[PDB]
Design an enzyme around this catalytic site. Structure first.
Site, PDB file in Angstrom:
ATOM      1  CG  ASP A 109      -2.111   1.304   1.221  1.00  0.00           C
ATOM      2  OD1 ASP A 109      -1.766   2.147   0.987  1.00  0.00           O
ATOM      3  OD2 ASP A 109      -3.226   0.517   0.888  1.00  0.00           O
TER       4      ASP A 109
ATOM      5  CD  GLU B 102      -9.039   7.619   3.881  1.00  0.00           C
ATOM      6  OE1 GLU B 102     -10.223   7.201   3.969  1.00  0.00           O
ATOM      7  OE2 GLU B 102      -8.092   6.828   3.199  1.00  0.00           O
TER       8      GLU B 102
ATOM      9  NE  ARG C 267     -12.092   4.709   6.685  1.00  0.00           N
ATOM     10  CZ  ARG C 267     -11.343   3.989   5.721  1.00  0.00           C
ATOM     11  NH1 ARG C 267     -10.946   4.316   4.586  1.00  0.00           N
ATOM     12  NH2 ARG C 267     -11.197   2.597   5.987  1.00  0.00           N
TER      13      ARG C 267
ATOM     14  NE  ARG D 255     -14.373   0.851   0.888  1.00  0.00           N
ATOM     15  CZ  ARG D 255     -13.153   1.177   0.991  1.00  0.00           C
ATOM     16  NH1 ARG D 255     -12.304   1.119  -0.035  1.00  0.00           N
ATOM     17  NH2 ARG D 255     -12.691   1.571   2.211  1.00  0.00           N
TER      18      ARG D 255
ATOM     19  CE1 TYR E 195     -11.122   4.868   0.780  1.00  0.00           C
ATOM     20  CE2 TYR E 195      -9.285   6.466   0.211  1.00  0.00           C
ATOM     21  CZ  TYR E 195     -10.028   5.531   1.017  1.00  0.00           C
ATOM     22  OH  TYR E 195      -9.141   4.955   2.016  1.00  0.00           O
TER      23      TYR E 195
HETATM   24  C1  LIG Z   1      -8.728  -2.053   3.900  1.00  0.00           C
HETATM   25  C2  LIG Z   1      -7.135  -1.716   4.272  1.00  0.00           C
HETATM   26  C3  LIG Z   1      -6.998  -1.013   5.486  1.00  0.00           C
HETATM   27  C4  LIG Z   1      -7.751   0.593   5.122  1.00  0.00           C
HETATM   28  O1  LIG Z   1      -8.518   1.019   5.816  1.00  0.00           O
HETATM   29  N1  LIG Z   1      -6.898   1.220   4.233  1.00  0.00           N
HETATM   30  C5  LIG Z   1      -7.387   2.546   3.928  1.00  0.00           C
HETATM   31  C6  LIG Z   1      -7.664   2.574   2.203  1.00  0.00           C
HETATM   32  C7  LIG Z   1      -8.942   1.836   1.868  1.00  0.00           C
HETATM   33  O2  LIG Z   1      -8.780   1.616   0.636  1.00  0.00           O
HETATM   34  O3  LIG Z   1      -9.812   1.622   2.585  1.00  0.00           O
HETATM   35  C8  LIG Z   1      -6.831   2.913   1.347  1.00  0.00           C
HETATM   36  C9  LIG Z   1      -5.668   3.690   1.624  1.00  0.00           C
HETATM   37  N2  LIG Z   1      -4.509   3.218   1.045  1.00  0.00           N
HETATM   38  C10 LIG Z   1      -4.945   3.531   3.090  1.00  0.00           C
HETATM   39  N3  LIG Z   1      -4.329   4.880   3.448  1.00  0.00           N
HETATM   40  C11 LIG Z   1      -2.749   4.506   3.696  1.00  0.00           C
HETATM   41  C12 LIG Z   1      -2.155   5.828   4.143  1.00  0.00           C
HETATM   42  O4  LIG Z   1      -2.612   3.479   3.837  1.00  0.00           O
HETATM   43  C13 LIG Z   1      -6.507   3.663   4.095  1.00  0.00           C
HETATM   44  O5  LIG Z   1      -5.886   3.525   5.462  1.00  0.00           O
HETATM   45  C14 LIG Z   1      -5.869   4.859   6.225  1.00  0.00           C
HETATM   46  C15 LIG Z   1      -7.263   5.199   6.420  1.00  0.00           C
HETATM   47  C16 LIG Z   1      -8.172   4.397   7.098  1.00  0.00           C
HETATM   48  C17 LIG Z   1      -5.300   4.188   7.529  1.00  0.00           C
HETATM   49  C18 LIG Z   1      -3.932   3.844   7.503  1.00  0.00           C
END
Ligand SMILES: CCCC(=O)N[C@@H]1C(C(=O)O)=C[C@H](N)[C@@H](NC(C)=O)[C@@H]1OC(CC)CC
Ligand SMILES: CCCC(=O)N[C@@H]1C(C(=O)O)=C[C@H](N)[C@@H](NC(C)=O)[C@@H]1OC(CC)CC
Ligand SMILES: CCCC(=O)N[C@@H]1C(C(=O)O)=C[C@H](N)[C@@H](NC(C)=O)[C@@H]1OC(CC)CC
Ligand SMILES: CCCC(=O)N[C@@H]1C(C(=O)O)=C[C@H](N)[C@@H](NC(C)=O)[C@@H]1OC(CC)CC
Ligand SMILES: *[C@@H]1O[C@H](CO)[C@@H](O)[C@H](O)[C@H]1NC(C)=O
Ligand SMILES: *[C@@H]1O[C@H](CO)[C@@H](O)[C@H](O)[C@H]1NC(C)=O
Ligand SMILES: *[C@@H]1O[C@H](CO)[C@@H](O)[C@H](O)[C@H]1NC(C)=O
Ligand SMILES: *[C@@H]1O[C@H](CO)[C@@H](O)[C@H](O)[C@H]1NC(C)=O
Ligand SMILES: [Ca+2]
Ligand SMILES: [Ca+2]
Ligand SMILES: [Ca+2]
Ligand SMILES: [Ca+2]
Lengths: 369, 369, 369, 369
Positions: free
Chosen positions: C64, C191, C206, C281, C315
């Site tokens: 990620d 976010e 969120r 989603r 998103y």
């Molecule tokens: C389902 C996997 C865990 C999860 O929630 N991932 C989130 C996510 C998603 O698509 O949901 C996409 C982004 N790539 C994530 N951002 C980062 C900096 O990594 C984000 O994670 C954040 C915000 C909650 C916290 C670190």
């Protein structure tokens, strides 16, 4: 500065080639959109080819009124590709014009019983109008006509094989300021090709219901309109019967269905663009009829070949070059032709009216399919 | 501001490499047009490589005078690709120049017995002229020469193996304002390379009929012209015999056919660009003959290698950089060479005259076929 | 001129389609980036789609929080491709906004315990802030909000399943001039979607910890802030329970995890954007709740379909069009939705608020995988 | 306006990531040039990545000093592709800088015993200098330094494993106005990284002959120069021995061969960029030595990781951002690193000096080979 649009069409005696995109030929290898219903509109700086794409490429497994259709533009003569095309709007029916300051883009999307026209001025959503008959709201598929900072378009709501409803719009800075429903019983207007002429708009459209000749509507800036058909025995639609004594009520013989087309009115004369074949979209020709706008004979004076009868033609529409772009004393008439191949895509050729020396030829798509 | 074109060519002692496109080498993988007859013309801001495309890509199924041929331009040194090329005109024979305000593009299309030159100024069709001998109307395939807001070109109508007809044109803002037919019996002019020099135009062309030396025509802004052949025993055409005593008329030995070329006149001297091989389009060299414009000896002073004799050369033409672009007090002479490969495509290299230190080398196409 | 940001959101009754990129469909053949977390931000001249790329293309073996992630931008509606995208910053979490003079880009990169936000103004690195809790420093993944030449953003440091730390930033010309840590016990902010409204910033975020309703924070230019949740029984997060009597404490039922979202506050009313499915989603809808910002009932007035429940959403975030771009008297509210496919990439659709006639439909990605 | 170049380097405590192109990863599928020796130079408007191409693409059968090598530029962070790259010059050794008005490009081409540097100002050939020792004339492979409308460069002629000849050049508007041969016995200067500092130029170069520490030359606008080696026991070249007591002359231990590098002088201190491995081009690190410019100890204060020791590094060079671009009161120091992969191509990462909080990490190429 806003385009005045108050000069007349200066008379032309022939049509000179302006652009050729060769979309399918390059798209055999390159990344080229599968496009349909292209048209050309000119800014005071440059002319642009607008097109509807299905969000798919030539030679791709993703290749009518789908949600994925968008209106996009490229500079004229360039290939419609994902790497050079500017996004305009989401649309399966569209029109676009430049009032001299900014582009106006009209895009129709939504379901067939709930379609909405989205008006965009300088890429900004400025006005919308929903479908009022709830039967496929649709528009020109060619450039709107702009006079004195105000742009005009014709939209059709209703069936494509019977009596429908037709509306004229006045659009200033992307905002609809006046609308008039055309009282046209026993008339059918589809896919109008509109041009400005002496502060007035003249549109030549397609009768899909019972007309092998082309209906026309002409109006001023107050949308005070007159309607009729082109009275020439040189019929302009496709399909059509052979050239006989014409009429300007709707000519019922082979009048069902049709093709998008254009005509340029010169007093009682008319420049007619039509397919060479009377039953299919093959070939194209430019015909000058000195009395064709009001006279019912099938006599003409000048015929110019554009596309040979063995090659695929399709939609054709009018566009103009204003004096702000040319520096001339008149509005130069021009036209594009879509060469449909097949996926199902098309390439475009464009011609402009000159009073200088011309030649007829065939500029086809020319891609080995 | 319009280019004055009243300064002279300042003298040069060598040629420095300016651009190399490597079209075929990139086109072995990338999406690159199959191009032929390229040439370079400079605006006051930038120099552009103009080229004719068959509407096809390298390594593609679709890859002489076809309706699909178009004139396109890219910035100098960049690959001719569908994703970066600007459309100019529909043409199987073309010329293009910039008068200091806007580009002028001349494009010839149509049948061989009915070809018409289409003149475009700022992308707007401004004038046309039909073929007057009805035998393949054709033009420079290099940049036209512009002096004081007026651009000049030479066109040929007639056979390519006998006596033809040659016309000089004065073009202001895309409009032809004066034409003169050259009275040149027993002369043959094809594919002239024209440059401005002290408010006068000098063109060096190709004798396809019976000349292994290059004919020339020089005229002022009133098209008052003088004609002749380069008298140097260093013959400039390809095919040609070995260097012997030259002549001020056409040299019949190996005079049939030829290749597009250029020469720069410096008083009674001449800079000659020619192929290294006397029978094929292989190699290139720049030869300075201090008395070659009027003297019949085969003695020269400076020889600079451009393309090695084992590598494919082709068309070559002159272009200039005006003081409005360079800031200098003179007009810098420059030239391009087309390296033909094979489909049948070519890449281009360009050189400019300097008075500083240079080196001869080989800059070939370098693609693996 | 700097954007004033002092006008209010003019009220809207529906949402009109603005852009559709069709990224995956074209990327089946063309060279298109594999992108995630896209968002849209508008300059006074144009709107741009920003996106994070893994440095890989669709249908490629590299497809990620990796070091290869970069933030890139294209004009709105165009495909994210290596041949048209502008580089912005190296980032696996990003935000971008335009204050009316230059773009401000915030890019977070580095290890999870040592991440630093890199602030770029006009492409120039102007300020940095390191992680202060050493647990994945992260930011909006949507546009920052700018008022009077100063842009505002919210960043989170700490766990994504418990209590974290949240900071508000004031950024002028890329320089951080004031920071305030939010005193929000038992709240979770991730976010945030921020918009300007009457010289004030409102952010809807969120709750990944224990909230199925969306928390909000609103602050002035001095970062004097108020916090809370949206009290509507129409829950805005995904996953969420069925619509029941809501609250604006954190609603713990299905409160774990979540999705990036937005809401527009209109007095005591709220426009809510949410997925149609309560567990995945899938789908999207625009819901107008006349008392949802403060009332706990599950009653609403207007529901507009955006994405059908059988199609993949993801998103969603807010963006605005200022009067300097529209020429209007208000700030137009707009939003984008990411349609996640799968590699794992997403395409984007965008909508803008209008007071004219609209229609609900489904504009999905539409790529056959 | 011409860049003044009279402010000093304001001190920095760390290096923040600026750009990352990911060229090889995208070039696994996309049309990306095979590039080597990249460098970055900034205009007052934007920074551009300059690079040398063999005229070949990644994953292509066409993929040292060849005639097909050209210098090309893209905006910083974008992929080097045929569809977005601007041609600069024909060169197998190059330097480029912007004096505040126009780009100056220096391109060396020709045979190894007859190479000539071609100077281009605004794309116009303005001056040339031929090789004076006839043994591979070569230049910085990084940006030249410009002070007060005059740009400065260092070129080397002679052997790469013994004593050579080194010249300093003053270039105004692309014209060489002064040259000085450096009297440096037992010194070796290759591939200098030059930056402006308080109306003076400081260059740190590569000793390919017998030096594991980096030689330096510093001169004013009159080319009055001083020479020496970086006395730090933190040796900057690759290959090199382990950190021990350094010397103010060339350190012969592992002194043969080397790599292009840079250093920033801060009084008696120095910021040193070097590979992590002492025998190969693997990894990169930024080391601050408070007395390293004149002191022979191996003690330092700040070490920042750039590329991990398990990942491929390569050439590195300095570039600056002037106050005309940043709006600051000083000249910001910046640097690029080439990550060589393998064909043989490289991607680039760039960093800029800040006085704010930074983090060390690894930003490698990341392509699977
Ligand atoms: C389902 C996997 C865990 C999860 O929630 N991932 C989130 C996510 C998603 O698509 O949901 C996409 C982004 N790539 C994530 N951002 C980062 C900096 O990594 C984000 O994670 C954040 C915000 C909650 C916290 C670190
Ligand atoms: C072939 C028979 C049906 C028919 O005429 N189709 C027309 C057509 C064509 O290629 O002809 C192409 C367009 N995609 C159609 N436009 C829409 C909005 O769908 C158009 O249809 C319109 C205008 C007559 C009415 C809905
Ligand atoms: C070897 C084939 C005969 C021949 O000479 N072809 C010439 C040629 C070449 O590559 O030589 C290339 C051009 N495509 C030709 N131009 C046209 C308008 O066709 C040109 O022909 C001209 C000039 C002599 C007369 C029509
Ligand atoms: C390991 C091969 C020998 C070697 O050092 N090559 C150097 C090199 C490298 O990657 O190291 C890359 C460049 N392509 C070389 N530049 C030229 C003009 O050829 C350079 O060579 C220079 C500087 C020392 C002297 C001619
Ligand atoms: C058209 O209007 C312009 C001003 O918009 C005026 O200057 C011009 O004379 C008018 N042209 C004609 C032909 O009436
Ligand atoms: C050329 O004409 C310009 C004006 O167009 C004039 O200023 C200049 O002196 C002339 N140059 C020469 C060399 O006669
Ligand atoms: C917002 O501020 C501008 C100046 O920045 C001012 O002219 C305008 O009246 C203000 N608008 C409102 C709605 O207060
Ligand atoms: C540098 O020169 C400029 C004019 O070019 C001057 O205004 C400025 O004060 C100088 N800066 C320093 C630090 O001396
Ligand atoms: Ca009909
Ligand atoms: Ca001959
Ligand atoms: Ca939640
Ligand atoms: Ca060494």
């Amino acid at each position: 500065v806003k385009l005045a649009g108050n000069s007349s069409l200066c008379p032309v005696s022939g049509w000179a080639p302006l652009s050729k995109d060769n979309s399918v030929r390059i798209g055999s290898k390159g990344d080229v959109f599968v496009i349909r219903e292209p048209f050309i509109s000119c800014s005071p700086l440059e002319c642009r080819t607008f097109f509807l794409t299905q969000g798919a490429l030539l030679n791709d497994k993703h290749s009518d009124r789908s949600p994925y259709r968008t209106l996009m533009s490229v500079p004229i003569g360039s290939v419609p590709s994902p790497y050079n095309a500017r996004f305009e709007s989401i649309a399966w029916s569209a029109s676009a014009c430049h009032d001299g300051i900014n582009w106006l883009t009209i895009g129709i999307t939504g379901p067939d019983n709930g379609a909405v026209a989205i008006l965009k001025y300088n890429g900004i959503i400025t006005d919308t109008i929903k479908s009022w008959r709830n039967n496929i709201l649709r528009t020109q598929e060619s450039e709107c006509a702009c006079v004195n900072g105000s742009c005009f378009t014709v939209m059709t709501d209703g069936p494509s094989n019977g009596q429908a409803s037709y509306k004229i719009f006045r659009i200033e800075k992307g905002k609809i300021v006046k609308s008039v429903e055309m009282n046209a019983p026993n008339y059918h207007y589809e896919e109008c090709s509109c041009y400005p002429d002496s502060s007035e708009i003249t549109c030549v459209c397609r009768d899909n219901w019972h007309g092998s000749n082309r209906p026309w509507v002409s109006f001023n800036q107050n949308l005070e309109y007159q309607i009729g058909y082109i009275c020439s025995g040189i019929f302009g639609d496709n399909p059509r019967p052979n050239d006989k004594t014409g009429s300007c009520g709707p000519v019922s013989s082979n009048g069902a269905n049709g093709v998008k087309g254009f005509s340029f009115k010169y007093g009682n004369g008319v420049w007619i663009g039509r397919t060479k074949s009377i039953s299919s979209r093959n070939g194209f020709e430019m015909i000058w009829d000195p009395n064709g706008w009001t006279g019912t004979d099938n006599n003409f004076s000048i015929k110019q070949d554009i596309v040979g009868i063995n090659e695929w033609s399709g939609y054709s529409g009018s566009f103009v070059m204003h004096p702000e772009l040319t520096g001339l004393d008149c509005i130069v008439p021009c036209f594009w032709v879509e060469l449909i191949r097949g996926w199902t895509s098309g390439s475009s050729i464009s011609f402009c009216g000159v009073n200088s020396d011309t030649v007829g030829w065939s500029w086809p798509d020319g891609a080995e399919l």
